[PDB]
Design a binder for this molecule. Sequence first.
Ligand SMILES: Fc1ccccc1Cc1c[nH]c2ncc(-c3cnn(C4CCNCC4)c3)cc12
Length: 281
Amino acid sequence: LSALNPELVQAVQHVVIGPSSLIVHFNEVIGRGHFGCVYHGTLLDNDGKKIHCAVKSLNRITDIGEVSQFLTEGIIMKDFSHPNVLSLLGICLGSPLVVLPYMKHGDLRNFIRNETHNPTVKDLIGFGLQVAKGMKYLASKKFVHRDLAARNCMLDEKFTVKVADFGLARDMYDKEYYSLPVKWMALESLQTQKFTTKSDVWSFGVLLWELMTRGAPPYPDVNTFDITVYLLQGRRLLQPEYCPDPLYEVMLKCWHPKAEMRPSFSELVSRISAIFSTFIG
Ligand SMILES: Fc1ccccc1Cc1c[nH]c2ncc(-c3cnn(C4CCNCC4)c3)cc12
């Protein structure tokens, strides 16, 4: 730790949570192991308010070099703040810790799939709108997500959707064992392995379809190897039963083969809020 560059240590100070400011309960995991080694934690703010947080131990980091890079992804993610983007509370420098806010209702896909929950069509569109706003912010910062899907969004106690699975919050589902999301990828990303905000617009289109089917798997009868040919033939996900026609038109524009022809996230926010506003609640 003393081995780290001093002007780099000074640059990460505003991201670092001191050991006296955080209580990690290493005896209690969040989400029955489904999200890896993620623990309940208590973060104390400057006024001593207790913040319930989710603490992840970053076991993949060992050497000085990897610590230094992690400090940089920390500085960068700490500048991203938006009501629809999962914030980084800070980092702890035992393995490095990533401190994130606690998301009461876990991931958006699991929440909508749960038989007990009954979101209305308006509630579902509202979640889509929230994602679109989170993405509009990321795109305004020229940040390409590359893995947008309903499983990669979180829901807090106020039912506020947070775009997650990026920066230090990536590899969300990395589970330990003892012994490419091609169905969300834009057609040009499947062909070139490159990602843009226009490829994120395609993935948002798929997430919208996931929201409207309450988390059904896209293209269940099509192999990931066959997705490219299926998309080149002009075949697309079909209109979900309870999905309004103007919203399905929004999903379709998202899956246009010409990247430049797809809506921008700013346009998607405009169109979805206009659609959301036609529902009583
Ligand atoms: F580990 C990560 C690593 C990187 C990014 C993101 C994450 C995930 C995460 C962050 N903050 C969280 N806060 C709560 C829950 C969670 C999981 N399950 N539950 C609930 C338990 C009762 N049943 C309904 C779900 C809540 C998960 C997370």
